[PDB]
Amino acid sequence: EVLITGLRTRAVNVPLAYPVHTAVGTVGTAPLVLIDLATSAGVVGHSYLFAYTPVALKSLKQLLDDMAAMIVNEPLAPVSLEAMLAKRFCLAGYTGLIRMAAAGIDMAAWDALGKVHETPLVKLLGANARPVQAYDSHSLDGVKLATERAVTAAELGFRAVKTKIGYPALDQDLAVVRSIRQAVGDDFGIMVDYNQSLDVPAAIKRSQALQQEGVTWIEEPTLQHDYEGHQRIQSKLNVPVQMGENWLGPEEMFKALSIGACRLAMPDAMKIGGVTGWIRASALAQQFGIPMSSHLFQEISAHLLAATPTAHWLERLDLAGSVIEPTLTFEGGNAVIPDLPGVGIIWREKEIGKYLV
Amino acid sequence: EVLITGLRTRAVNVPLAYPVHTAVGTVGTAPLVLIDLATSAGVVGHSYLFAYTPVALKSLKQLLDDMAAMIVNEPLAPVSLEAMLAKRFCLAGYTGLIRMAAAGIDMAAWDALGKVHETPLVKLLGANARPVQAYDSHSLDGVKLATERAVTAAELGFRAVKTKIGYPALDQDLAVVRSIRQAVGDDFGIMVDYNQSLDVPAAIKRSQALQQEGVTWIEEPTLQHDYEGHQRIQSKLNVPVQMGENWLGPEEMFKALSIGACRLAMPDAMKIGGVTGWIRASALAQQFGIPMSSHLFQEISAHLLAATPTAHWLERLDLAGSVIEPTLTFEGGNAVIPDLPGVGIIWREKEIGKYLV
Amino acid sequence: EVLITGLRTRAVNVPLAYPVHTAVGTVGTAPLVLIDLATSAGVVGHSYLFAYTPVALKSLKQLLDDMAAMIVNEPLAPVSLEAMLAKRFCLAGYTGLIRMAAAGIDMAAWDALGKVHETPLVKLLGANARPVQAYDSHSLDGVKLATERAVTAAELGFRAVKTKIGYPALDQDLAVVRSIRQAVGDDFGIMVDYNQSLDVPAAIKRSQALQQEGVTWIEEPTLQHDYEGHQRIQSKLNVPVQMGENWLGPEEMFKALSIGACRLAMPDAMKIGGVTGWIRASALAQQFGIPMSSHLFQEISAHLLAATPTAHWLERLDLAGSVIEPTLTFEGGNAVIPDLPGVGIIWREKEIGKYLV
Amino acid sequence: EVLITGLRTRAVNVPLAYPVHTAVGTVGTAPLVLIDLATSAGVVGHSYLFAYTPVALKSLKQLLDDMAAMIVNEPLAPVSLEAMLAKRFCLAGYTGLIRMAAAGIDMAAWDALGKVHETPLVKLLGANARPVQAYDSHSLDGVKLATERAVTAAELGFRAVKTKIGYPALDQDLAVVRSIRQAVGDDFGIMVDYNQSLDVPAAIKRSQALQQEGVTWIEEPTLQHDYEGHQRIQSKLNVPVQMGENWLGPEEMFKALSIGACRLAMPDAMKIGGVTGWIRASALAQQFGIPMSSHLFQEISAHLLAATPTAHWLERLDLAGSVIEPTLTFEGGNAVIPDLPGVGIIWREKEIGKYLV
Ligand SMILES: C[C@@](O)(C(=O)O)c1ccccc1
Ligand SMILES: C[C@@](O)(C(=O)O)c1ccccc1
Ligand SMILES: C[C@@](O)(C(=O)O)c1ccccc1
Ligand SMILES: C[C@@](O)(C(=O)O)c1ccccc1
Ligand SMILES: [Mg+2]
Ligand SMILES: [Mg+2]
Ligand SMILES: [Mg+2]
Ligand SMILES: [Mg+2]
């Protein structure tokens, strides 16, 4: 009855006002693939994917354009579509870029379902829209720029910031944390992200120094696939270890949570498998007693976290603000869901043309 | 001193004389990406990648063409190159198609190193070339075609065949196995591959029936990422459970072997990370006491298994025979390594032009 | 094609400028067995073994002279040779002095392979030569001599020293550490080695006092074969426990790492099985997330660590400097690999004659 | 008061009437080192060591001759001597040939203690001499010679034989077992020894076939250091897995028994550390509920097993019968301890001269 009738993708490389500097490199632009999923009902679902590096951008678009053939004329039923794509990519490996592509389709298909039923996505999922507390996410900025951006964030109403660390010496890490505490006072949340840059001995040593400074969480201290090494770092800390942005699918989260790798989780809506993957991740987090935050994709994440029983923080990191209307607002440090059908993504069509690859 | 000076890729879609039918679909053609890695020494390394479905072919080529920029002018040092690519794809996710691309570069770079030193790859790795026992790999062919191809294989000298199973009823699975035993006698090896098609209860029930028929191994009875479910099936069997073709990198093998998912392993040279990933996988298999076979890539696998302490079987499944010279020969059911520098892959240039995508 | 044609060994007992004093005894001279492995290609591989005590020197030479018969006329293929010697010493026990002898042959055979191909060993193994940070290793020297040698080491550019401890009273241990920190300042690395001299209760008590002084690592606090006791000491510490110099073969390391005995590893190139044993140990250390350092054998270890993914520190302890040319240089506290075929060991033939046993 | 005053060793290579053929090689002669330990009391202790291969014979003698210096003028107190040698070989590695040498001294020192006190060793250890059931140990002899030697053994009164297996095909293994059962009837014990020749899958498959034939135990099915692999084979069998001949010291037995590698143990008096190592091994076996047999050294083992709470079988395999008087007798399949001071070893001095190396 409602069928998918087409899929269109556009690759843009959008400039970021502040380049996201991390201990392992800087993301200077946002390579995005914008997706339009057309339906027989005359509504169009929308989502975008984040390619991380321009090196993977054209490849991800090509893959989605070659996948269009298998979903056109399929019913608009995201849960049924996901099971079919899992099965078709059986042998190839339903992970990495293939999984990320399948999640962009899922996300657009749920946006289209909410437009067919004229309802906000959070309401379609059975929950009320509520304000979600947000922290402002900045990068490995050195003492002065990370302190300047942190003062700006408390002035816009945010109650927590995330800074990037993992400098050559532990002392540079603590300098940054201390200068931020100095400026924002003891009330404020300071989250720190190591971006997989340390080995386990080094991470135990640096994290116990940071724990004495009062940080909110320590994020991905070592290689992300090393769940056992994260459990070993976590076992020596009172402060929570946070991870999850790099889990591809609920099945990688299930393996990390099973061995107790972390006390907090932050799935990425694209890598976890879209809305379908998020509902499953959310059920796991509830049973393992894990507070759950989001990573990127703030527009759909404000909807998904209002439906997440152990919802914890939304990450504000605006990667697509240039090509979409600002329907998501932040008020007093909280994201406010727009009262729009679906997810509330509206393309700024003439900006897109400027950034086209 | 020896530098990489260029990378060229060509995507072909080659016809297979017998389409590889599996319980989850048929691979009717081989989508391959042929790689030429040029060096300052005037030698060219060669490898190919297998894309599994044509849907992923152009995307994988595009990715390799966009990656060329980061390895041109780097020293021809595969172990150092791999650590650098692992680090650059840190945030994106060093798995799936990205990992597969990086492995094609590794494999071509080791072929080029062996050509610089005028030595067969097995000798460069410090071992003697030896004949490696091979089994012939056929598909979900129904009773009559799988029995016909099995008689042909014993006539060419092979001592074991792999058939695909996972039919609607257990009885169809046993019919195929029985008709093959009937024709080849009790001496012959019959391996069976379920290609992830069963759930754990179903796999315990079918595998104990097959075990009473005397099969060599039962391969991937359930979803490949489910290592715990494979351990649960394995715990109820005397016959070995075989898996490993879908592990991306030695770190996924390490996780499966740690929980005792299988009694046999068969890494895929491309998914395990190339020659660099194979040497690491081989060290793990030796310590866990796991006999190690290969999956696809018979040309480089004959070299890698002669250097593998618990080497077990080579899988004969010729996906690129149309576009490369037959330097790998099978004699009395054993692969014989060619006495050629590197890996011994020589393009049949006018065939390639016929299959170009 | 390249065959081993002879093996010659010479036992020397070389004077050490500073006798290596440990909590369980002093190594006053270096009992070494120098090995020359002749090949049909007209190149000669070189290695030496360290006998620890003169009591074991003539026995180790005799063993190698009696083993010559089984490797002469075998192909120069170290990985194939190792599997054959493992098999021949099956019943006797492939450990202790037999394993150490087999490793001297491995090391000489890889040096000869690199000379056949005119390439540095690190390049033959597929990696780039890079500077490796080194620490200077001194002994149980008492407060004043260990402080004097530590000032000398920071003056030669080293950024860390290893001192020996395990005095009758904990207070003597801390005095030594404190006097060194006093002299070199808070930036410097101080590693401490107990040389198996404590029982587990005693080691928990002394290590938590040393941890409050800021040492880099605590090395072999109790009996080396007691992996469980090391795990019990490690579980009570933030500082890493270091061990590994006494593991014979990758299979003993595999057992220690499996139960989590230590957070750092330092295999000995001879006891771990030579270059072949090192590549396997290196794959294990990477999967268990263990930073890996070396023990003795600085010349070949500078090559092996440049090829080791979790490479951590090189131990400078020059046992054979009197009978080999100084091709290994230390610059700004880092070992610099010589640009010589193989390993770069060149006998000083008239010195050898002075030390001959 | 009683001091050790000298140590003398003689290396002989004695012909064996039946060469001990195993799946990994044949022991055609017995390379032995005969030890004479002189004391201030005017008594001389005696023991011999078994070198397994002539390749290790001269090296083991040399080592003992170089160790003489550290025990001459020490009190004749084996337990105190062992702790001192453990400590002196701290750094070198108290295992392999060094451990085997130290055990030859222990065994001679306990023989000398029993001669000082004019008492049989079993009585000095606090137990009564009792007959110990013995099995006759033969080799990989093929169907006809292993059946001929098994009939001879039942005729001399033995109630069990050990045969060697591990032929190219399982069918050859069962042929040998069946032909022996045929000849000796269903009452007789048939033990089988694989001598580490199988991998774990292969060992599960062959052992369940042998278990259906009724063998007494399956001995060392896989590599001896692989305790986990033995536990995995054992977990699939009703018949006991037997091992222990290759444990060097009670600390290796402790590790194997801790993970449940076997249901039966057979320490070797030399590799376990002599009489001192045997008393410790015996305490471990009792607590883990492990029936304990011996391996080789029948003369001292008849004494040690009469003092072993879970004593099970003595292995008859006469390696030194040519150079020692037959004071150990077998009567109705049981070893009968001689009523002689110490261990009852008396050199046949003119035979020794014939076999001298
Ligand atoms: C810093 C990061 O790890 C995060 O948590 O926000 C991140 C990684 C990659 C791209 C954007 C953001
Ligand atoms: C059947 C298979 O699982 C195998 O093991 O060969 C296989 C899967 C996919 C492509 C080729 C072969
Ligand atoms: C002190 C030591 O344990 C080390 O780590 O260097 C060592 C032990 C034995 C000989 C040389 C060095
Ligand atoms: C066969 C054997 O394993 C045994 O158990 O007796 C053995 C091994 C080596 C020498 C003699 C005997
Ligand atoms: Mg992050
Ligand atoms: Mg398969
Ligand atoms: Mg040390
Ligand atoms: Mg035996």
Q: Say whether B331 sits in a helix, a strand or coil.
A: strand
Indicate if the alpha-carbon torsion angle B214, B215, B221, B224 is positive or negative.
Answer: positive
DSSP summary character for residue D120:
B
**Which residue in A198, C284, C281 sits closest to B254, CA to CA?**
C284
Instruction: Say how many Å lie between the CA of residue B106 and the centre of ligand 6.
Output: 23
Active site residue D295: yes
Q: Is D245 annotated as a binding residue?
A: yes
Q: Say whether C102 sits in a helix, a strand or coil.
A: helix
- Beta carbons of C313 and C293 less than 8 angstroms apart: yes
- Beta carbons of D268 and D239 less than 8 angstroms apart: no
How many angstroms separate the CA of residue D34 from the nearest CA in chain B?
38
- This structure was determined by X-ray
How much is the CA Rg of chain D, to the nearest whole Å?
20
Strands of the A25-39 sheet, one edge to the other: A4-22, A25-39, A44-50
Q: CA A153 to CA A318: how far, in whole Å?
A: 14
Q: CA A8 to CA C20: how far, in whole Å?
A: 72
C-alpha torsion angle, residues A222, A228, A230, A232 (rounded to 10): -120
Bridge partner residues of D22 (DSSP): D25
Tokens (6 digits) for B348: 């049949």
C-alpha torsion angle, residues D289, D291, D292, D293 (rounded to 10): -170
Q: CA D141 to CA D171: how far, in whole Å?
A: 15
Say whether A119-348 and A1-118+349-356 share the same fold.
Answer: no
Across the interface, whether the CB atoms of C238 and A208 are under 8 A apart is answered yes
For the D1-118+349-356 domain, the top CATH level (class) is alpha beta
Catalytic residue ranges of C: 164, 295
Strands of the C44-50 sheet, one edge to the other: C4-22, C25-39, C44-50
Across the interface, whether the CB atoms of C289 and A236 are under 8 A apart is answered no
Specify the fold of D119-348. TIM Barrel (3.20.20)
Instruction: Say how many Å lie between the CA of residue B91 and the centre of ligand 1.
Output: 8
Active site residue B46: no
**Which residue in C238, C240, C222 sits closest to C290, CA to CA?**
C240
Around Cβ D155, how many Cβ atoms within 10 Å? 8
Q: CA D298 to CA B28: how far, in whole Å?
A: 67
Resolution (angstroms) equals 2.1
Instruction: Say how many Å lie between the CA of residue B218 and the centre of ligand 6.
Output: 9
Q: CA B87 to CA A196: how far, in whole Å?
A: 10
Tokens (6 digits) for B197: 């098609």
Residues 6+ apart with CB under 8 A from C285: C253, C257, C265, C291, C292, C308, C309, C310
- Determine how β-strand B132-137 pairs with β-strand B160-164: parallel
D210 lines ligand 4 (CB under 6 A): no
C-alpha torsion angle, residues D121, D123, D128, D134 (rounded to 10): 0
Q: CA A190 to CA A180: how far, in whole Å?
A: 8
Cα B80 to the center of its chain, rounded Å: 24
- Beta carbons of A330 and A136 less than 8 angstroms apart: no
Catalytically annotated residue among B115, B230, B295, B312: B295
* Chain B CA closest to residue A59: B59
How many Cα atoms within 13 Å fall on the side-chain side of residue D331? 9
- Residue of B27, B67, B255 lying closest to A55 (CB–CB): B67
Bridge partner residues of D12 (DSSP): D32, D356
- Determine how β-strand D44-50 pairs with β-strand D132-137: unpaired
- Determine how β-strand D334-336 pairs with β-strand D132-137: antiparallel
H or E stretch at A242: strand A241-243
Domain ranges of chain A: 1-118+349-356, 119-348
C193 lines ligand 3 (CB under 6 A): yes
Q: CA D129 to CA A239: how far, in whole Å?
A: 65
C92 lines ligand 4 (CB under 6 A): no
B316 lines ligand 2 (CB under 6 A): no
B317 lines ligand 2 (CB under 6 A): yes
How many Cα atoms within 13 Å fall on the side-chain side of residue C184? 28
Instruction: Indicate the annotated binding residues of A for Mg(2+).
Output: 193, 219, 245
Catalytically annotated residue among D61, D123, D164, D303: D164
Q: CA A49 to CA D72: how far, in whole Å?
A: 80
Residue B188 to residues B154, B157, B301, D280: CA-CA distances in angstroms? 8, 11, 23, 50
* CB environment B237-267: b (16+ within 10 A), e (fewer): bebbbbbbbbbbbbbbbbbbbeebbbbbbbb
Instruction: Say how many Å lie between the CA of residue A24 and the centre of ligand 1.
Output: 11
Catalytic residue ranges of A: 164, 295
The residue with tokens 């030698």 is B43
Angle value at C-alpha C70, between C67 and C73, nearest 5 degrees = 130
The residue with tokens 């389409």 is B19
Q: CA C305 to CA C297: how far, in whole Å?
A: 12
**Which residue in B90, B85, B103 sits closest to B37, CA to CA?**
B103
Q: CA A178 to CA D252: how far, in whole Å?
A: 52
- Determine how β-strand B334-336 pairs with β-strand B329-331: antiparallel
* Mutation target among A90, A105, A255, A272 for the B interface, most CBs of B within 10 A: A90
Q: CA A55 to CA A61: how far, in whole Å?
A: 12
Across the interface, whether the CB atoms of B62 and A67 are under 8 A apart is answered no
